[PDB]
UniProtKB/Swiss-Prot annotation:
GO process annotations (BP): glucose-6-phosphate transport; glycerol metabolic process; glycerol transmembrane transport; glycerol-3-phosphate transmembrane transport; phosphate ion transmembrane transport
Protein family per UniProt: Belongs to the major facilitator superfamily. Organophosphate:Pi antiporter (OPA) (TC 2.A.1.4) family.
UniProt keyword annotations, A-Z: Cell inner membrane, Cell membrane, Glycerol metabolism, Membrane, Transmembrane, Transmembrane helix, Transport
PROSITE patterns membership: GLPT, MFS
Chain ranges on the Cytoplasmic side, renumbered to this chain: 1-32, 81-89, 138-156, 204-244, 292-304, 352-370, 419-431
InterPro entries tied to this protein: G3P_transporter, MFS, MFS_dom, MFS_trans_sf, OPA_Antiporter, Sugar-P_transporter_CS, Sugar_P_transporter
Protein name: Glycerol-3-phosphate transporter
UniProt organism field: Escherichia coli (strain K12)
UniProt keyword Transmembrane helix present: yes
Main location: membrane
Length: 434
């Protein structure tokens, strides 16, 4: 049984010194701990093109992949309290290895891996476990030090999905030679994830327990859900960006979860470069997104909707050119992928930020969060499931129709939120009226 606090004070003249280390120490912990989860989500994707040379794949597999998101979905509804009770040091590795092991269940046991939604169910757990991963990472950051946190986080949101999610096709690519079987080498990435998990456990801590000093060191010292229903629920404005975020997320994931599979269906050059792109795409987001921020602050003078516009437009132009390509896509897709990815995150971050302004004082928090989930939740189901099915009764072309089309609205919609937010401003004028 764990939770366990076990706190005991040994201050002893110069706890400061063991703090510097206990902080430089722990930060890598949760950061890489969190990063490790991402090796685990997008393994099945890589499975599908390998998997199903065999009639297996309908476009159904997408429904199967669809699992991860749903569980992550029903997940936060309750895990949000558990980590609060339990201890971040254990709970984080305890969730990873718990999940990353499950993946191993698939990569090795035939019945388990090839059944047509036996996987849905196995995968579904993955989602649930994936759930735990972040909130202890949250409880920790609370124990860093107030009014500093803004910084520790800046780094965590934007780098964490990419540093980890872009490495797995690389391992599979490598595990091909050593573990010859192709239909199922989606296990090798998971093999190492457990390893990071240990490292995670071996370096994190609560930090109340050895110092005994609630973060003072500078003497910072600092209603219900209703808010969502009261301030966020109608907000016809917040809705538009949320219904917009969706398609943004569908262009990102739908283009990405198929990237290996669609390559080698048509434009089939090789697995070698295929997987070397998926890496490149997810990793190339780091520099861009980082820039998307500065360009947005310096060039667009703080207008977030408009930066999405600049970026959202730029992402769409690439997606279509890349849509128009024959077996001469070799030196087009490399750049194509490097680019698509480079920008897709731009609006993901911007909307959220945008949301903060679209409502009152506390609403921001739950206002900006609502967006992320309405966005991610749906964005995926469609990104994965629907696309697959929009290829069975239709061609593969109709795939991009929903994707390219999807983006198109995100912008038109991002426009409306821009007009609307400003029309709203003009009305305070009527406040003086009677």
């Amino acid at each position: 049984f764990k939770p366990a606090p076990h706190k005991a004070r040994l201050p002893a003249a110069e706890i400061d010194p063991t703090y510097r280390r206990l902080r430089w120490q722990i930060f890598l912990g949760i950061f890489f701990g969190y990063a490790a989860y991402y090796l685990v989500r997008k393994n099945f994707a890589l499975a599908m093109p390998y998997l199903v040379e065999q009639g297996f794949s309908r476009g159904d597999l997408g429904f199967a992949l669809s699992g991860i998101s749903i569980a992550y979905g029903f997940s936060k509804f309750i895990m949000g309290s558990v980590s609060d009770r339990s201890n971040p040091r254990v709970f984080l590795p305890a969730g990873l290895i718990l999940a990353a092991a499950v993946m191993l269940f698939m990569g090795f046991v035939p019945w388990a891996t090839s059944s047509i939604a036996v996987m849905f169910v196995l995968l579904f757990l993955c989602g649930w476990f994936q759930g735990m991963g972040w909130p202890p990472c949250g409880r920790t950051m609370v124990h860093w030090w107030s009014q500093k946190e803004r910084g520790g986080i800046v780094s965590v949101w934007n780098c964490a999905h990419n540093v980890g999610g872009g490495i797995p096709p690389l391992l599979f690519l490598l595990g091909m030679a050593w573990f010859n079987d192709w239909h199922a080498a989606l296990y090798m990435p998971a093999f190492c994830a457990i390893l990071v998990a240990l490292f995670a456990f071996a370096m994190m801590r609560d930090t109340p327990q050895s110092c005994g000093l609630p973060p003072i060191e500078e003497y910072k010292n600092d209603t219900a859900k209703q808010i969502f229903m009261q301030y966020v629920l109608p907000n016809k404005l917040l809705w538009y960006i949320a219904i917009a975020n969706v398609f943004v997320y569908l262009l990102r994931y739908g283009i990405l979860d198929w990237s290996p599979t669609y390559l080698k269906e048509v434009k089939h050059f090789a697995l070698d470069k295929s997987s070397w792109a998926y890496f490149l795409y997810e990793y190339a987001g780091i520099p861009g997104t980082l820039l998307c921020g500065w360009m947005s602050d310096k060039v667009f003078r703080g207008n977030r909707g408009a930066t999405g516009v600049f970026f959202m437009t730029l992402v769409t132009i690439a997606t279509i050119v890349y849509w128009m390509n024959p077996a001469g896509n070799p030196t087009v897709d490399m750049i194509c992928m490097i680019v698509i990815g480079f920008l897709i995150y731009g609006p993901v971050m911007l909307i959220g930020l945008h949301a903060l302004e679209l409502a009152p004082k506390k609403a921001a928090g739950t206002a900006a969060g609502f967006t992320g989930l309405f966005g991610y939740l749906g964005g995926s189901v469609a990104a994965s499931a629907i696309v697959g099915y929009t290829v069975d009764f239709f061609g593969w072309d109709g795939g991009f129709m929903v994707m390219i089309g999807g983006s198109i609205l995100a912008v038109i919609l991002l426009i409306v939120v821009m007009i609307g937010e400003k029309r709203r401003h003009e009305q305070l004028l009527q406040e003086l009226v009677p």
